[PDB]
Design a protein around this nucleic acid. Structure first.
Ligand SMILES: Cc1cn([C@H]2C[C@H](O)[C@@H](COP(=O)(O)OP(=O)(O)OP(=O)(O)O)O2)c(=O)[nH]c1=O
Ligand SMILES: [Mg+2]
Ligand code: NA
Ligand code: NA
Ligand code: NA
Length: 323
DNA sequence: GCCG
DNA sequence: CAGTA
DNA sequence: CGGCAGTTACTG
């Protein structure tokens, strides 16, 4: 509900690509609140009443109804669409997009022929369209299975779980998030080397984006893969290997959504605790600015439910975390 | 941008 | 580190 | 005034 959002969503992306992350966050929250309410908004007071919507935002919602158009939109820089185009290249963010624009680049052809690309950005440009597409969850299953098969091939005890949007039950997935760990709490160490080389053997992996294979403590692998046969597109792969003791927090984190994690972490903070993909801690010592000064104590969290419990929150199935 |  | 994830 | 997730994990 509420298509007075699609117009704010435009301003949100504009601010975001331009690097004004906080203002963009504000819009994201407001847009989210509107899309989450039960009835069409038709009153200034009805807008301010909504948490996440202030005078400024409501003031704009008023015009969206009293005018049917937002004057602010007719003043967005012409650079925005190009910044969005550029920042949609994997490995390039607002800073790079703005730099390229300042240098006169206006299209991907300009980037391809004149820009100095990092290894990651070159891969992103090579798969520009594929990286903007989502795959049916069915294909995500095959990819997760492909990774699990290669993993359990050298250690049948390894536990592999597809997380992210997949575990949240979404019909399509941006990429495939696979969490790998081992019940014995030690057999997870230094497996990337073997797993990745195995996946490379069968020609499954096509490009590596983030993979510190010289570090025996590598925690993640971000890359590209493709299943065999016709009609197959290059798909993004995200693999993390975590120690069993961090299984719950890691599973919770990797399942998301990102907004859900942020909300949960923000809550933990208001309660003198801290939550991360590594652990839930209590008695955390923070400064006047909120930065974690003291480590506090790690709380035992053998399951996701324990995390919710310790935070005094009712448990939520992955599908109920799709924020 | 919103909010404490 | 800044940038991007 | 000043936080808005994580003292998150790589890259160069
Ligand atoms: C991007 C991002 C992800 N995460 C966590 C929660 C996400 O579910 C998980 C994996 O990230 P993503 O794969 O980016 O998210 P997603 O799988 O939910 O959505 P998509 O289908 O587009 O891939 O990592 C964060 O905590 N913060 C972030 O900023
Ligand atoms: Mg994903
Ligand atoms: Na990008
Ligand atoms: Na590498
Ligand atoms: Na991912």
């Amino acid at each position: 509900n509420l298509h007075i959002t699609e117009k704010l969503e435009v301003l949100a992306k504009a601010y975001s690509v331009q690097g004004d992350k906080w203002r963009a966050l504000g819009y994201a929250k407001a847009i989210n609140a509107l899309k989450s309410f039960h009835k069409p908004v038709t009153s200034y007071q009805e807008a301010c009443s909504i948490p996440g919507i202030g005078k400024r935002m409501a003031e704009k919602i008023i015009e969206i109804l009293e005018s049917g158009h937002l004057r602010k939109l007719d003043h967005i820089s012409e650079s925005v669409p190009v910044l969005e185009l550029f920042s949609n290249i994997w490995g390039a963010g607002t800073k790079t997009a703005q730099m390229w624009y300042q240098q006169g680049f206006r299209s991907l052809e300009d980037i391809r022929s004149q820009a100095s690309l990092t290894t990651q950005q070159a891969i992103g440009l090579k798969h520009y369209s594929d990286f903007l597409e989502r795959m049916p969850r069915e294909e995500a299953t095959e990819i997760e299975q492909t990774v699990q098969k290669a993993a359990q091939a050298f250690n049948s005890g390894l536990l592999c779980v597809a997380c992210g949007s997949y575990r949240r039950g979404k019909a399509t997935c941006g990429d495939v998030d696979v969490l790998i760990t081992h019940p014995d709490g030690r057999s997870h160490r230094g497996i990337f080397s073997r797993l990745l080389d195995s996946l490379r053997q069968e020609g499954f992996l096509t490009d590596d984006l983030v993979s510190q294979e010289e570090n025996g403590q590598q925690q993640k692998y971000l890359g590209v893969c493709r299943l065999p046969g016709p009609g197959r597109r290059h798909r993004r792969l995200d693999i993390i290997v975590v120690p069993y003791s961090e299984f719950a927090c890691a599973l919770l984190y990797f399942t998301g959504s990102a907004h859900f994690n942020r909300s949960m972490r923000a809550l933990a903070k208001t309660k003198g605790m801290s939550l991360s993909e590594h652990a839930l801690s209590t008695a955390v010592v923070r400064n006047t600015h909120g930065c974690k000064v003291g480590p506090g104590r790690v709380l035992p969290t053998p399951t996701e439910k324990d995390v919710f419990r310790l935070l005094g929150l009712p448990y939520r199935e992955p599908a109920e975390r799709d924020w």
